[PDB]
Design an enzyme around this catalytic site. Structure first.
Site, PDB file in Angstrom:
ATOM      1  N   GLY A 126       1.061  -1.127   0.059  1.00  0.00           N
ATOM      2  CA  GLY A 126      -0.546   0.207   0.473  1.00  0.00           C
ATOM      3  C   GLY A 126       0.994   1.536   0.240  1.00  0.00           C
ATOM      4  O   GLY A 126       2.217   1.459  -0.037  1.00  0.00           O
ATOM      5  N   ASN A 186       4.156  -1.779   9.145  1.00  0.00           N
ATOM      6  CA  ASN A 186       3.609  -3.348   9.680  1.00  0.00           C
ATOM      7  C   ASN A 186       3.193  -3.986  10.420  1.00  0.00           C
ATOM      8  O   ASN A 186       2.541  -4.667  10.594  1.00  0.00           O
ATOM      9  CB  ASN A 186       3.824  -3.974   8.070  1.00  0.00           C
ATOM     10  CG  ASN A 186       2.455  -3.580   6.578  1.00  0.00           C
ATOM     11  OD1 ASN A 186       2.880  -4.511   5.151  1.00  0.00           O
ATOM     12  ND2 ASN A 186       1.722  -2.779   6.605  1.00  0.00           N
ATOM     13  N   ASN A 239       2.838 -10.493   3.952  1.00  0.00           N
ATOM     14  CA  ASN A 239       1.501  -9.848   4.135  1.00  0.00           C
ATOM     15  C   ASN A 239       1.056  -9.849   2.666  1.00  0.00           C
ATOM     16  O   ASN A 239       1.799  -8.907   2.209  1.00  0.00           O
ATOM     17  CB  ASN A 239       1.834  -8.305   4.643  1.00  0.00           C
ATOM     18  CG  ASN A 239       0.214  -7.760   4.992  1.00  0.00           C
ATOM     19  OD1 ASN A 239      -1.191  -8.035   3.890  1.00  0.00           O
ATOM     20  ND2 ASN A 239       0.363  -6.718   4.964  1.00  0.00           N
ATOM     21  N   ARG A 287      -0.347   8.641   8.476  1.00  0.00           N
ATOM     22  CA  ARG A 287       0.135   7.833   6.947  1.00  0.00           C
ATOM     23  C   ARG A 287       0.361   8.497   5.775  1.00  0.00           C
ATOM     24  O   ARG A 287       0.835   7.756   4.923  1.00  0.00           O
ATOM     25  CB  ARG A 287      -0.743   6.359   6.570  1.00  0.00           C
ATOM     26  CG  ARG A 287      -0.752   5.524   7.822  1.00  0.00           C
ATOM     27  CD  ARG A 287       0.830   5.412   8.863  1.00  0.00           C
ATOM     28  NE  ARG A 287       1.581   5.055   7.624  1.00  0.00           N
ATOM     29  CZ  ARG A 287       2.644   4.324   7.577  1.00  0.00           C
ATOM     30  NH1 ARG A 287       3.396   5.353   8.879  1.00  0.00           N
ATOM     31  NH2 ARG A 287       3.364   4.581   6.943  1.00  0.00           N
ATOM     32  N   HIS A 297      -8.993  -6.717   6.233  1.00  0.00           N
ATOM     33  CA  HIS A 297      -7.280  -7.251   5.352  1.00  0.00           C
ATOM     34  C   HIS A 297      -6.055  -6.832   6.991  1.00  0.00           C
ATOM     35  O   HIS A 297      -5.578  -7.775   6.216  1.00  0.00           O
ATOM     36  CB  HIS A 297      -6.684  -5.501   4.903  1.00  0.00           C
ATOM     37  CG  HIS A 297      -5.584  -6.729   3.679  1.00  0.00           C
ATOM     38  ND1 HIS A 297      -5.645  -7.893   3.387  1.00  0.00           N
ATOM     39  CD2 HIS A 297      -4.681  -6.282   2.957  1.00  0.00           C
ATOM     40  CE1 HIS A 297      -4.701  -7.998   2.274  1.00  0.00           C
ATOM     41  NE2 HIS A 297      -3.902  -7.002   2.506  1.00  0.00           N
ATOM     42  N   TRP A 298      -5.889  -6.302   7.518  1.00  0.00           N
ATOM     43  CA  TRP A 298      -5.319  -6.207   8.994  1.00  0.00           C
ATOM     44  C   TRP A 298      -4.948  -7.527   9.782  1.00  0.00           C
ATOM     45  O   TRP A 298      -5.400  -6.170  11.081  1.00  0.00           O
ATOM     46  CB  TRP A 298      -5.274  -4.879   9.622  1.00  0.00           C
ATOM     47  CG  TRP A 298      -4.765  -3.263   8.995  1.00  0.00           C
ATOM     48  CD1 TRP A 298      -4.249  -2.987   8.241  1.00  0.00           C
ATOM     49  CD2 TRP A 298      -5.504  -1.823   9.483  1.00  0.00           C
ATOM     50  NE1 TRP A 298      -3.193  -1.475   7.734  1.00  0.00           N
ATOM     51  CE2 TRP A 298      -4.071  -0.742   8.386  1.00  0.00           C
ATOM     52  CE3 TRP A 298      -6.249  -1.709  10.365  1.00  0.00           C
ATOM     53  CZ2 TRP A 298      -4.844   0.436   9.003  1.00  0.00           C
ATOM     54  CZ3 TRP A 298      -6.376  -0.277  10.732  1.00  0.00           C
ATOM     55  CH2 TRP A 298      -5.794   0.550  10.009  1.00  0.00           C
TER      56      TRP A 298
END
Lengths: 271, 271
Positions: free
Chosen positions: B33, B41, B100, B172, B250-251
């Site tokens: 991402g 991450n 991941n 972010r 997703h996390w």
């Protein structure tokens, strides 16, 4: 016979059961194969869980060494009543429940009718949703006594057949022919057997209402209950986790014992 | 900036990386991402694993604070070469790998080309098999800088949006606009993006040859990589287990941190 434990009157039925450990109660509900008993299914599970919990494993009415009442009316609701009767008898107000296949279906049904009595659930290769009868299940429920038939049934449950020895087949065959066992077993799930899968199942609507933290376990190669059944339960139960073991048949607690025990104990430890 | 760790020359690329713990080596490979880095991450994963393993988490070439070589040719094979170059640089002869998504695809590819260098694998919401680009992934890879765009991306990754705060979106967003970051990111996975999912994937035939004990993890509500992708990997990898977290996007390492860390550490402890 280590399959015989203690005896207690539950829901009016003299019930055989095992009780090991102290602390938070956990009820283990066995499957529905021929000669099945709480001890036969959970002998490798109880020792591990009993170190941190009070483990109760009873023989459901119609199975094992629990009484088989004359003209008894077996049904999902009657079995749920037996489970509750066992908890009442032992002053177990609320407990976690681990159900194997048949027992998983009963676990779900009990949680729906007695939500206040059930905390966390572990559903292993569990009944509970409708799925098309498999050749493996029809063979299991359609069992007739013989060492060869039992060896073949055991093979249906296992991924690694090397675990199915002549001795094990002999011992389970002997368990299956005990007085009155085959008689009640053969009349329990008569053809057409799809009727019983449907009867033991709970509606998608009802399952979606379950608030219990749930751990769904299945063996990729399960020949009795299809993996697809657990995938569906996993789409329906909100607070759920799904764990699928590769190279594992129906016997997850037997073929992946250590991994199974660790996952279950940690799951309950979270509470 | 805690995202900046140590520096080492790997496969000819000045690489930023983190190295914590002692013992059996474990390589953690981040996703793809905008603004992604090994630290971003794995910050909640390293502390737990480092108590029992030597954890190495590098920024893949083209991401984080690792050098972005002028006219560099990014590809699955080049990234695999970077991973191997990092292991070579650190004298890591064989290691477990946790990947991941994007990194999961690289993990699979590395295990196929350098089987002797990889032991156990953990594939989390991993790339590796072909699946139709999702709206979530196209939005992620098609990101353009703004706090609102980043907030929305974070929402795509999360099940529980309460975790997406203005502050996190701001931090972010700032990470995504660092010198040269958005430039290399926007040119990394240009439209049509299905091409990159297909390029990062490995064939069913190749995946079936993997001998590594593997743990596949996925979030039921993952909006970026569909659960169906992991179900497929689970049908292909022989020595595999699948764990799906309900109420998780997703996390997984972020939303189910403790459960994730426990499962991974115990998985590696088996070795």
């Amino acid at each position: 016979n280590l399959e015989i434990g203690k005896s207690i009157l539950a829901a009016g039925v003299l019930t055989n059961y095992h009780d090991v450990g102290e602390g938070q109660p956990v009820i283990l509900i066995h499957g529905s194969g021929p000669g099945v008993s709480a001890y036969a299914n959970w002998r490798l599970t109880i020792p591990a869980l009993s170190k941190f919990y009070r483990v109760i494993a009873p023989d459901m009415v119609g199975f094992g060494f629990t009484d088989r009442p004359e003209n008894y009316n077996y049904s999902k609701d009657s079995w749920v009543d037996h489970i509750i009767g066992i908890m009442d008898a032992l002053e177990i107000e609320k407990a976690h429940i681990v159900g194997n296949a048949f027992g998983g279906g009963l676990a779900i049904a009990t949680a729906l009718r007695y939500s206040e009595r059930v905390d966390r659930m572990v559903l292993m290769g569990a009944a509970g949703t409708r799925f098309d009868v498999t050749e493996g299940l029809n063979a299991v429920w359609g069992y007739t006594p013989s060492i060869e038939n039992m060896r073949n049934l055991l093979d249906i449950f296992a991924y690694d057949r090397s675990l199915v020895t002549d001795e094990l087949a002999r011992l389970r065959y002997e368990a299956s022919i005990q007085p009155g066992f085959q008689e009640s077993f053969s009349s329990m799930f008569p053809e057409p057997r799809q009727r019983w899968i449907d009867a033991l199942a709970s509606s998608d609507e009802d399952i979606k209402t379950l608030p219990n933290e749930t751990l769904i376990i299945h063996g990729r190669e399960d020949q009795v209950v299809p993996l697809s059944s657990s995938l569906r339960l996993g789409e329906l139960i909100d607070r759920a986790q799904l764990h699928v073991f590769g190279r594992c048949g129906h016997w997850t607690q037997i073929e992946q014992t250590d991994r199974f025990n660790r996952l279950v104990v940690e799951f309950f430890n979270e509470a």
